[PDB]
Each structure stands twice: as C-alpha cells, then as structure tokens.
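Hey forum,

I'm writing up a methods section and want to include a predicted complex as supplementary material. The small molecule is alpha-D-glucopyranose. I've pasted the protein sequence and the SMILES. Can someone with a working setup run it? I'll credit the forum in the acknowledgements.
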Amino acid sequence: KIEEGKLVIWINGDKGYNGLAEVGKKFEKDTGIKVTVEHPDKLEEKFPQVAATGDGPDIIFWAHDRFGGYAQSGLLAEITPDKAFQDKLYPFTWDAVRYNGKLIAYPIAVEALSLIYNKDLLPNPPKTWEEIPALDKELKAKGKSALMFNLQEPYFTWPLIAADGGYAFKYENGKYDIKDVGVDNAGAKAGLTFLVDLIKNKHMNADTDYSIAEAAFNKGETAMTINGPWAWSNIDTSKVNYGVTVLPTFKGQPSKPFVGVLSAGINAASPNKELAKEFLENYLLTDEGLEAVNKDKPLGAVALKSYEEELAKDPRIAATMENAQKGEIMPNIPQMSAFWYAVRTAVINAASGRQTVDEALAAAQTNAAAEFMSKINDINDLVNATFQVKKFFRDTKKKFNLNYEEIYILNHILRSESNEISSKEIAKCSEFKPYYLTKALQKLKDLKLLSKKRSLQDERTVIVYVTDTQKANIQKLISELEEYIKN
Amino acid sequence: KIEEGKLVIWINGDKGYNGLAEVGKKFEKDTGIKVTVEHPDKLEEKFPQVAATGDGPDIIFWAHDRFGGYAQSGLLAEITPDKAFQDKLYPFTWDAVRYNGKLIAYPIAVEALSLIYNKDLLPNPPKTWEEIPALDKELKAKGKSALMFNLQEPYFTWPLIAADGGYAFKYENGKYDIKDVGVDNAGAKAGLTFLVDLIKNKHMNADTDYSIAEAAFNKGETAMTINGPWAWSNIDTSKVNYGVTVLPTFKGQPSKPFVGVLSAGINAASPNKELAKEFLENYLLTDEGLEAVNKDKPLGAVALKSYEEELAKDPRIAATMENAQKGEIMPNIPQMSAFWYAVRTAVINAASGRQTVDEALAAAQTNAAAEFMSKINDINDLVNATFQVKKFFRDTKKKFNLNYEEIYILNHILRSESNEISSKEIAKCSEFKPYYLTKALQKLKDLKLLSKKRSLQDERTVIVYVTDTQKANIQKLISELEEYIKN
Ligand SMILES: OC[C@H]1O[C@H](O)[C@H](O)[C@@H](O)[C@@H]1O
Ligand SMILES: OC[C@H]1O[C@H](O)[C@H](O)[C@@H](O)[C@@H]1O
Ligand SMILES: OC[C@H]1O[C@H](O)[C@H](O)[C@@H](O)[C@@H]1O
Ligand SMILES: OC[C@H]1O[C@H](O)[C@H](O)[C@@H](O)[C@@H]1O
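Reply by user p_vandermeer:
Happy to help. Structure tokens for the complex are below, copy them as they are.
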C-alpha cells in the first residue's frame, strides 16, 4: 500500500532532506500533489525489506552502489528519460545508474570522501599517512588528537585499504569478476594493518564513529577528520577555519575512496511513477531544486551539468572531484552489499583486536565473494526455511516441474555478469552432485531456454552459454514462477 | 565473538548507565574483570539481531516484556538464583521474568508512567482527561500548552487506550489468549479517538516526541508531561517546581499504564555467565549498587525489598507505585513485540490523519494477533534457503539421522508452553503428511527422549507427552545439532 496521489521520499539522514522538502513544496505548489520526505534509519537495508513487500517510499535516495541489487530483486522501476534530458547530466553519472542495459535511477550528485582539517590547529595538513603517527603525539601534546573519523563504516577506512591495491571485484573488459576479490591481497592487508596499528599506538580508538569524530573535530578537539560534502554544513555553523583537501597518500599511492552517485530510484511497486519522474526530472534536477538542497546540505559535485559549473568554482568541490578521480567509482552490481559486509566485519573485528588483519581479511575475502548470505540462525529458522522451500516446489510441481538444481542454475545464470559459464562454476558453487548437475543442465537444455551448452575445450566441464534473448526468457520465467513465493 | 574475561552491558539510553558504570567499576575493583556499559540505539531490536548471530552484550537491560520472545529464540541464559537470594526481591518481579517455568532475567526495578506537571504553572493538576481540552485554551491563552508527552511510542498513549477497556491479549486462567486481542473494542477506540481529537482541536500535534515534550516541559513551555522515573533527573536540574501524580482518568476509569520490570537478561551466547550472575546478584542488586544507579537516573520502585523500603518514602515513588497498581503488568510473552507494533502503527497513522481510529485499530487488532517470520521473498532467497537446508541435513546425516519432520517436532515441542501436545497441533501446523507425522513421532518415541505419546481419547489423534527431564534432553540435542548451522 503505497497510496496513490502523493510522493513519499526516503533520503539518508545526513542530507538535505529539509532542502529536498523545499523542492517537494514547490512541486506541491505547481502540481497540487503533496510530497513528504523522510529519513528512516538504515533505509538502505529497510528499503529492500518493506519494498519487497510492495510497500516503502515512492522514491529512494542513496549511493548508486545499492541499486544494482534493488533492480535485481525487482524493487526498482525503469526510468526512461529522453535523450535531450539525459544531456543535462554527465554521461558518467547515467553510467552508474545503468544496470543490465537499463536506467534504474536518476543520478543526483557525485560523492567522494575528502580530507578535512582545522587550519587554526594546523594550517598545513600532512600529505601522507606515515607522517601522521608522529603528528599525533605533537598535537596529543598540546592536549589534542591528530585524526578522528568514522571507524565503524568501511566507507571511510576503504580509501586507505584501497590506496595500495585494495579492490572490490576485479574489473577488466567492462565486467566485474565477482570471483576475483581483492581484499586479502598485499595492498589490502597493508592499509588495514596500518589502521589497526594507528589504534594500538593509542592514536585513535576502535570505537570512534561519525557522531564522535564529527563533534571531536567541530569542537576543535581533533586536527582533522575524513568526510564528505554533507558534513560541511555542521562545520560551517561550527564556524571553524577548516579546509577540504586531498586524502593523505599511503605507501606513496593516493587514497582510492569509493565514489558514490547519490541517485533517486523510483519504487517498482509505486503507483505514482509518472509523478516521481516529473518531480525528479522537472523539479529536483533543475538549478533551483538542486541548490535548494545544497543549501540544507552540500551535495558535492552535482550530476546536473549547468549547476556543477558553479559548484566547480568552489575549491571544496574541486577537492572532492579531485579525491573522486583518485578513487574508483563504486560498482552497482548486487554483490556489493556482500562486499560492504565482509569489509565492515573485517575492519571492526581487527581494529578491536579480536583478529589479526590476515584473519579478518581472509574471512572477509571469502565472505565478499560467497554466493549466499546465510539467513538461518535457529533450527527454528531451519524448520521455517524448510517449510517454505518444501512448500514452494510442491506448488510449482505441476506447471513448472523445475527441481531445485534447475532453479539454482537459472538463478546463478540470471545473477551472472557473463553470458557463458562453466560446469565448474555451477559445481564449485552449490554442493551439487555431478550426476544431478549434468542431468539438470540437460533438463534445461532440452528446454528451449538454457541455450547451448557444450563440451569444454580442456573437456570434462561443459560450457554453458546463454543468448541475449535467452537470458531474457530465463528472466521472464523466474519472474513467472516467482509469483508463487513473492506473495 | 563475545570475548571472555569481561562484561559488556546494554542498557537503554534514558537510564543510569553512568550509575551502572559505577557499579561496574566497584566490580572491576574487587573482581579484576572490567565491565563496560553501552546504550546502543534501539537495543531492544538490535539485541535479537546481533544476539541471534551469537554476538551482542553479555547482559541486556530492558522491560521484561521483550524477554519472552528473547528466551523463546534462545537468546537468553537461564538464571538460577538460590531461594535465599530470591527472597531479597518482591515475588511479583520474579514472576515477570519467569517464562515457561524458568527464570530468564533478574528483575531490577518496576516502572510505570506517572503524570508530571509544573506546579508554578498549575499547582493543581486536572484529575481527568475530559477536563483538559479546556485547560489547554486557558494556558494556551497565557502563551503556553496544557499537555505535551511522547506521541510516537505507544507506551505513552496506551494508558489512555487501556483505561477504558483497552487490553493487550485477554487474560484469565494464568494464560494469555493471543487470539483474543482487545485493541479494537469500544474502550480502545474511545481513548484513541480522544487522543486523535485532542490533536484535531490543536491542543497538541501528532509529531510531539520524547525529546520535544521533555524540553517543552522542563523549559516551562508546557504545564505537564507523561513520563517515568528516568525523566525526573532532567527535571531535577531543570529545577522546576514539579509534582508527580495520578494519571487523569478517562470516561471515569483510571489510566492503565502497562508496567514494565527493568530486568537484566544474560546473553545465552555469552561465555561470562558466572561473572554476570555474580555482578547482578552480588553487586547490582545490593543497596549501594542500586542507589549508585538511582543517583544517575531514578529506577523508580526497585525490586530489591530492602532499598525499596527507602524509595517508598518518597511521594514520587509512591505515585509511581500507585499508577502501577491501576495499570496492568505487561505480558512477557513473545507476541508482545507484534502487539507493540500494531499499536505504534495504529496510533501514529490515526493521530496523523491518514486513518480513522476504526481503521487504525481494525488493522491494529489483526496485526497484533499475527506471527511473523523470514518468509523468503526472491527465488534467490529460495535458492539461498534451499542451499542452507540441504546443507544442514547432509552435515547431520551421520551424527544425528534426524529428518525434517523429526526436527520440526522437537522444535515445536521446545517452543511450547505445554508438556502435552496433540497430533492435531503438530499436524495443523506444518503441511505434514499423516504418514510421516506418525512415522516421525514414532521415530522419536523409539528414541528415549520423545517421552510417552499415546492414543487420544476422542480419535486416533495420539497425544504427545514430554517429561520435564525429557524436554531437557530435546533441548540439549537441539543446542547440539544447532551447532551445525551456527552462521
Ligand atoms: O556511511 C556511508 C555513506 O555515507 C553517506 O551516506 C554517503 O552519502 C553515502 O554515499 C555512503 O554510502
Ligand atoms: O561503509 C559501508 C557503506 O558504504 C557506503 O555507504 C555504501 O554506499 C553503503 O552501501 C555501505 O553500507
Ligand atoms: O519507550 C518505552 C520505554 O521507555 C523507557 O525506556 C522504559 O524504561 C522502558 O521500559 C520502555 O520500554
Ligand atoms: O511502545 C513500544 C514499547 O513499549 C514499551 O516501552 C516496551 O517495554 C518496549 O519493549 C516496546 O517496544
């Protein structure tokens, strides 16, 4: 029940929701339809839950990295702006909101973690991470602290782990090899071990967090923090003489902050799509609209060309956009949430002292690439799960005589970047039986949708190939038999 | 990973955590083991999440109403204080922390919403709710507001809905009929409709909240608020001439504030149980310990007899304890969280204006009497689930040849209040096959743990009976084969 006739927006708490609300009112003024902004807590996780139910906001705002998995689940409506309109925005921002050839959300503003310091407490910010353990005892001297940033969310500690070779999922020919996870490499271990030690040497504690670090900096207690545009508002009225700049380099390399494109996705459930499209296209993505929000909180380097040729003047923005370039754009693929988790754990677990970086990261690597996030804790959850499963198949037995192994495959395929997979992949993943695996690939082959599958080269591992129109029919079928459980 | 050798406590933010921390230090002094208190935000919901994972605090503090569902899930350790000790506390407080014959948490202090007003702005508090819409325009006159209390959490608006016949789950022969939900009755509709209108007539707005109302009162802007002992601290330094008293009566009946027993449950996962038990029994539940915290924030009518014979002197306490009596003790049963939800929704939805009390409550009644569970949304969740299941059995095939149907039963039994169940129960619940159901009961019977099962009276709906030592072995087995799915 999304309730027609109005817009409900979900935007994160550290952002211009009051500003966006202004946009929403100008809309109501002209349109006549009301818009109400809300900043649920943890809307990124809450969205897929309530949105799977067919409820939730009409529009959800968040970094483009979550939208891949949303669109995947079917939570997001496909946006179809004409070419003229797309021209008002930077080609690379649409790219971030493009998933499997479709545009899933509107890009709003580019975000990158900048380095912010207190010029009255250090008119000269260090340009490296190694020349800091020292700068801490010098400022720890006059009763202060060198650095203080959020150590709870891996979005902040990633730049350091990334800098020297840490990476999400290897990238190459336009695709991401979700199997190739770079978080347990030398470069990754390096930056983390450093962060770990910065703590061991009482320079900063494992429990620092956004709230803590933000005050600590705005109240002069710390010489510098690590944050983005949205945080400038507070520092502004906290009227401190601060500067935004390049993230210190590690082992010589710059910090590679994952970059996020704050985008607005329209709920697939929503019954107000034409309205949301009109709000975002005609109202929000206009100079007024964007500045309206920028006033409340900094959007950073907006995606809207026109207005960005104003924000660009600002050295803060140019600083953001500089850090941006040095970092990589966040993948929008579904396996991202799994990535963020693996990392969150690893960091917290090793900064605390429960694990040695090696451990934290070896587990982290495994977790980041695991195909499944196990949702079963109690045997009651087991029973719960078993009941659900058992029910599912029995209901689809007649029509769709698709057994588990089969369903598993079609799914593994649909959630795949590649149009060609090997019996090895599908075998390593899923404790399957060579007997059923093969019988299953066959079972689907015999069906005009599994597309060709054919003897490996090396042999003993048949390659599974799926067309483009093939992968289109596997989708239409899943969406079809997915009605038997989606409720 | 709970980390042995220390205590981590989770207590709600509006309470004596600094005071509790003092207790924790006296402990560390004598013991040598450290204790760190923390007030996560929304620990009541966050606990079951992180605690299901096998992580979380060693000790969790909260109103006894949540503990039923915690113990249910298996999150809570069973506390076994000797009789002599139990004598130091009021028999009724142990009753609140007793679930299915076991003691799940230590009772700490009784809590009830009192009525607090500003004597300098009204030395005479109204004694009814009807004689208030008026008292608002008289104080709204000299630039003030009559009432201002939290309208977001249904814990505050319940007293009014309860007063005239609103009730959670009907109670009678010592049991709660979770099917009999009294929130859509006449008495319920009445009090809500009143609250609704108090807003319509611009006496108070639908968005008031703890924060807002608390300042509004402490800053003299409002003549009275609705709150409990923990809020007296702020009003104290806010040095206002306030008084704590009886909640105005509605339609003639007193306000029935759900009463909560702040209890301390020990995490079932925790590896420090003997220590937590020692902390709570030997340190926290002593006169010093309790007053240490009472200083920080008022506990209200403590459960510890000795110290309560001091607090009882205070007219505030006697006011609390008076309101308490007029209200009912909150049920500790699992269906409580579902209750709190249904109500939260209904209230907010109808106070806002989105729904007419009728609607809000009819939905609320339905919701309060529902069950909830990870239902699987995506076929990817299906695959996810199937993989988990399939794996589980294969791992327990050798050691524990317990098939699904069997596991299902032992679980249904363990999560049962009764020590006797009928083939009907286990049959209606679980689309089971009469063939397997029976074969399964048999399979377990043949095992020395399913206890007796024997021909019904009525039909051949065989009655399943489990000892007391029987239900103890079914538990030890589940905990045993439950290691195969831990994460
Ligand atoms: O906590 C990390 C998050 O911080 C802010 O919300 C950023 O806008 C968002 O892109 C990022 O994902
Ligand atoms: O640090 C973890 C977080 O980083 C960024 O905020 C991502 O946008 C978000 O998805 C993730 O949870
Ligand atoms: O908001 C409701 C809560 O208020 C206070 O924290 C009470 O101590 C607690 O018993 C209750 O659950
Ligand atoms: O209003 C809802 C809340 O009411 C009381 O405070 C309960 O103790 C708490 O568990 C519940 O969530």
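Some notes you might quote in the supplement: Chain B is about 45% helix and 15% strand. Chain B touches chain A at residues 1, 3, 42, 52-53, 73-74, 373-392, 394, 404, 407-408, 411, 415, 430-431, 478, 481-482, 485-487 (CB under 8 Å).
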